[PDB]
Every structure is written in C-alpha cells, then in structure tokens.
Chains A and B, each alone.
With several copies, the nearest count.
Chain A
Amino acid sequence: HGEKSQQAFLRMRTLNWYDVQWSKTTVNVNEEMVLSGKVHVFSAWPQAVANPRVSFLNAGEPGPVLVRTAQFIGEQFAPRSVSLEIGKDYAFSINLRGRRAGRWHVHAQINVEGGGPIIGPGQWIEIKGDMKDFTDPVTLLDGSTVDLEHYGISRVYAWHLPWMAVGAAWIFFWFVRKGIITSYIRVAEGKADDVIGDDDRRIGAIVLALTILATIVGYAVTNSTFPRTIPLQAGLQKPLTPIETEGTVGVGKENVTTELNGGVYKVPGRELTINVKVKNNTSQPLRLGEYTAAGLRFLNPDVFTTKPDFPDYLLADRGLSVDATPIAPGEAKEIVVKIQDARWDIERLSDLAYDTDSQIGGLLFFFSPDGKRYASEIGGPVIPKFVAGD
C-alpha cells in the first residue's frame, strides 16, 4: 500500500498498468473472486532497476486475507519466476479465494530480480463470513484431498513438541543432580569428577543410544507414511508470450507513434503540461482518450463522455485536451496535452522533483470514432516550474 512513497519516476518508467479488473468487489469466505489485467514493460527501463529478465506476479494484500488459488501471466500458470521483455505488454490474472473477514485494498503487483516491488492498481475488496469456515482444499497425485489451511500442522507438533520436552528434561535432570553453585564450586576446588564421572556417562550413553533410535524409527515411519515425495519445484519458467492484439504498442499494421517534445510540471502543484508529436499511422480518425502513469487513469471527458468503473483513487477526468481534432490517418501532428488532477498530487507523482532522474513515463490511449483503442508509449525529460504558495 506503499505506492505513494516510492520514487515517482520509477513507478512511471517501469510498469504501465491498464485494464485492471476485480471480478467481484465483495465475497464470502471461500468465494472465488479473480483480479486480472494487462501491463506494458516500459522501453527506456531505468538503470536503477534490474532487467525484468526475472520477475514475479503477486497480489498486494495484507497477509493471506485471500488465498491465491492460481495465477497466470504472459499466457502461463505463473507460480514461479518469469521473464518480461523490455517493451512488450503481457496479460495476467490471479484466482483469489476469500479467507479473512474484512475490507482489504488488493493490488496487482509485480516484483523484479534486482529491483523490488512494482505496485499497480488496487481495489477495496470486502470479505464476509467467518475465517473458521475457510478451507481450500487441494488434490494429491495419489488421488486424495486435504485442507491446506490445516494439513500437516498436526504432524509438526507431534514431532517437535515431544523433542522440545525431551530437551527440557535433559537440562532439568542435571540442574537438579548437581547444582549450578555446587558444581561451579566443585569445579572451582580441585574437582570436578565429583560433578561428572560415569554412571553420569552411562546416562549419556543410554540417552544418546535412545535418541539415535527414536530418530531412526521417526524416520522409518515417516518414510512409510508418504513413500511418494518430490523436491521443491523451482526455477525460471519458459519465456512468456506477449499480447498481440491489437495494438498493443508496436504490434500489427495499425499503430500510433508518440515522441515527447518537452513538458512541464508545477512545483508544488497538480498540473503537468506536455507536447506530444503524434504520428498516425492507422487508417482511421483518432482522438486522445487516456493517459496512464502509475496506474492512475487520466481521462479526456470528451472521449470518456462517461466514465468507467475504476477504484477512486487513481481515476482522473482531466487528461484534457486537444481540440478533439481527430488528427489522421496519414497525419503527422504535434499536440499539447494538459494533465491536471488532485490525484497527480495525492499520489506524489508531483515529487518527481526529488528524483535523480526528472522524467516521465507511461501510456497514451487513442480512440477512434467507434470503440477501437490504440496504445502508444510516452516517455522523457520533463522540467519543473517552481511556484510560490506552499
């Protein structure tokens, strides 16, 4: 839930989150909600963060309030590490059984090898019922079923606690069989050997030989129970497959281009004002409908006459405008865009002044006259303007 605090420019110039969706924003204990979406691996990936050559799909939740049943990215089951190539987009989803009574702000999240966590969209999800009732379960190869929420926990205690008691007995035995003070004094004067000496040793020998036996047995039995068993399954998964529809930046015949050509943010402030040399490049008319950054959507209310379903918070209606002058096809045009929202400031993207790279990143969403959408990536050096009035 940190997102606000992470260096602005990194949150922007890494993972560009879009089309994020929570199946059901309420749930019963055991009720199988699913969060999903797509994400664009920025192209000018910061030196600061390692190559996403090795990454991991997660759901950003305060502990296991919701179990994860399964999860899939780049068209794969992704319980292990996965490669994201620089400049592609990928699709993902996470199956999330409900577990803990309450109201939990659940993010889509991805971590990188030599980088750390990148936190995306999160929506308040609400569970009801009683944790008491939570189960899974899961199915073994041999056939059977087991409640993960309870499986094995018994055997653990059954083997640890006896031993812990054994240990504790060993100690107490000697502590009351030659004191501390006594035995320190025995040692202190000549002897010693008043403290130890067989059959103290014969005790040892016995207690030892028993312990070895107790283990042999303990092993042999737990070898009979479960004579199946395999090593923990781990390693980087086979390379991912990116989204190819359409587009989906740099895919197909139809596309939009965007150079940045300067831009300014007010410090402190709410406004970012940027010049975009757009080329188009489809064969249709295109008005700019959206700008996404750290998962915040900045909308043009011309294009979004209404006004979609997306957690507050995180959802602006002032990524405006152009003159809604649909541009092309064929047309090579430079256009000014203003972004102006409270969220730009509330999510601390305004603290891009603080950063060791003053630079913008993220997605531009073009829309046709009908329903079709065209994604082009925007990135580059923005300047700050320092305003009086704190």
Chain B
Amino acid sequence: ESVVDLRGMWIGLVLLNVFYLIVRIYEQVFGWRAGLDSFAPEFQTYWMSILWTEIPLELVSGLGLAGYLWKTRDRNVDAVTPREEMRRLVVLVQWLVVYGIAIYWGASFFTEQDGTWHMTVIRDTDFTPSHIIEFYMSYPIYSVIAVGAFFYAKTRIPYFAHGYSLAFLIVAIGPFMIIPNVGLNEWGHTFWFMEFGWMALGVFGVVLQILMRIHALVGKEGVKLLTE
C-alpha cells in the first residue's frame, strides 16, 4: 500500500488547534465579564458548566481510547511483517506529534496563560476561568493522547508489546505527577508553614527506541549504502 499515511495525524492537529482556538476565543468573550465573580450565576452558566462536563467526558474519553486499543490489539504481534511494522511505527511517530501539540497547549499556552489571570483577579475559590481550562481541560487531554500513544505502541509494535519501555511508561504516567507540582505550587503560602526537578522528556528514550527499530528495519542496503 504505502508506509507513510499522515491522514490520521492531520485529523488530530486540525480537530485540536480548532478546539483550542474556539476555547481561547470563548474565554476571550466570556472570560471578560461572566467569569469575574464566582458568586454570580453567569459563572455557573459559562464556566462551572464547562468543568462539570469535561472531567466526566475526559475520564470516559480516556478509558475509551484505552479499552479500544487493547481490544483491537494485534493478538499475534511477533509475527508482524517488516513493512507493516514500519507503517505501524510511522503511526506511532504520528501519535507522538499530536502528543507534541497536546503538550504545547496544555503545558505552555494554557499554563503560562494562568500567570496573567493571577494579575487580574483575587480568586473566589481555586476554580478560576483559567484553571478550568489549564487544569481540568488542557492537561487531561494532553495526558489522554499520552496514554493513547503508549497503548497504541504497546498493542501494535513488538518491542512495546512484551515490555513497557520505561521511557514510555514515564511519559504516560508523569502527567499524573504534575498536579503535585504545577497545582500545589499554587497553594504555596496557604499550605505553607507545615512545609533539580522531576520531568518528562521521557519522549527522548521513546524516540530513541523508535529510531533503533527503523535502523533495524532497513538492511545494510538502505542503511550504509543509500544513506552513506
């Protein structure tokens, strides 16, 4: 057929930058006057709604993608052909490029966005308009693609099947270890008196491991010869 597909990748990137661009806008509009005082009832309609929806939706979205990928797992993985592995890897690299963008939105944009909103209110509770998106939206999402990528590899690539790359395992699990950080970073002073850094570039390992498989699935021929 062909190895490189990409159709799948675009679906994600497009479906994604759109959903974030909608939100940015919807927060532009309803951030300013609708989510300035939490005690108001237009907060319940415009923010406290989004929260109550997304979590259960996210939580099911996650176990969904999980179960599905496991279910549709290639039961006889070891048998997989050189082309079909190669294709499968390129799908994995794909998941990782979406994981890439999810990481961007969840961890840089909607994260340092929160910085400027702290200069704008005095906080009615921990649920700002910025936290609804940063914490209970942009992160969970970026975390759920993470899981996807992990389970896809596991159920399609012999290497990640019968294994757990530690690198990948990290990647898929440390997002549940940023709340301890980015979150509680906030209840600094309030939670204080009763009293370097653990990070996720685990992707390094993961792409390194992918790379080795490619280097394998090209003979001395393609390898040495075609790319000196």
Give residues in A with beta carbon < 8 Å to B. Answer: 1-5, 60, 62-63, 102, 116-117, 119, 179-182, 184-186, 188-189, 194
> Which chain B residue lies CB-closest to A178?
B227
B72 adjacent to chain A (CB < 8 Å): no
| Cross-chain contact A2 with B228 (CB below 8 angstroms) | no
* Binary contact readout B158-194 vs A (1 if CB under 8 angstroms, 0 otherwise): 0000000000000000000000000000000100000
A62 near B120 with CB under 8 A, answer: yes
Interface residues of B (CB under 8 A from A): 32-33, 36-39, 119-125, 189, 211-212, 214-215, 223-224, 227-228
B193 → chain A closest CB, angstroms: 10
A116 touching B215, Cβ below 8 Å? no
| Chain B minimum-CB-distance residue to A60 | B122
Query: By the criterion CB–CB under 8 Å, are B39 and A184 in contact?
Result: no
Which A residues touch B124, using CB under 8 A? 1-2, 4-5
CB pair B122–A185 under 8 Å, yes or no, is no
Checking B38, B214, B228 against A181 with a beta-carbon cut-off of 8 angstroms, the contacting residue is B214
| Shortest beta-carbon contacts, A-B, top 10 | A2-B122, A1-B37, A63-B120, A182-B227, A184-B211, A5-B124, A2-B124, A62-B120, A185-B215, A188-B215
Q: Which residue of A lies closest to B224 (CB)?
A: A189
A62 to nearest B CB, angstroms? 5
CB–CB A184/B215 < 8 A = yes
By a CB distance below 8 angstroms, the chain A residues around B228 are 186, 194
The answer to whether B211 and A1 have CB atoms under 8 Å apart is: no
Which of A4, A62, A189 has the largest number of chain B CB atoms within 10 A? A62
Known: A102-B33, A181-B214, A188-B215. A1 touches B122 (CB 8 A): yes
Pairwise interchain contact A185-B39, C-beta atoms closer than 8 A: no
Q: Which residues of A contact B212 (CB under 8 A)?
A: 188
B208 and chain A: residue at smallest CB distance: A184
Which residues of A have CB within 8 Å of B227? 179, 181-182, 185
* Contacting pair B122 A181 (CB below 8 A): no
User: Contacts A102-B33, A185-B223; is A2 near B215 (CB within 8 Å)?
Assistant: no
A-B contact pairs, 19 of them (CB 8 A): A1-B36, A2-B122, A2-B123, A2-B124, A5-B39, A62-B32, A62-B36, A63-B119, A102-B33, A116-B189, A119-B122, A181-B211, A181-B214, A181-B227, A185-B215, A185-B223, A185-B227, A186-B228, A189-B224
Q: How far is the CB of A313 from chain B (nearest CB, A)?
A: 12
Residues of B within 8 A of A102 (CB): 33
When distances are taken between beta carbons in the complex, the residues of chain A under 8 Å from B189 are 116
Contacts of B215 in A (CB 8 A): 184-185, 188
The residues of B that contact A186 with a CB separation of less than 8 Å are: 228
A62 neighbours in B (Cβ, 8 Å): 32, 36, 120-121
- Shortest CB-to-CB span from A6 to chain B, Å, is 9
Q: Do B223 and A117 touch (CB < 8 A)?
A: no
Would you give the shortest CB distance from B43 to chain A, in whole angstroms? 11
Give the chain A neighbours of B121 by CB distance below 8 A.
1-2, 62
**Residues in B whose Cβ lies below 8 Å from that of A4:** 39, 124
Point out which of B37, B122, B189, B228 has the most chain A C-beta atoms below 10 A from its C-beta. B122
Least Cβ–Cβ distance between A197 and chain B, in angstroms: 14
Residues A117 and B39 in contact, CB atoms below 8 Å apart: no
Chain B residues with CB under 8 A of A60? 122
With CB as the reference atom, state the residue of chain B lying closest to A181: B214
**Min C-beta distance of A164 to chain B, whole Å:** 16
Q: Chain A residues near B33 (CB, 8 Å)?
A: 102
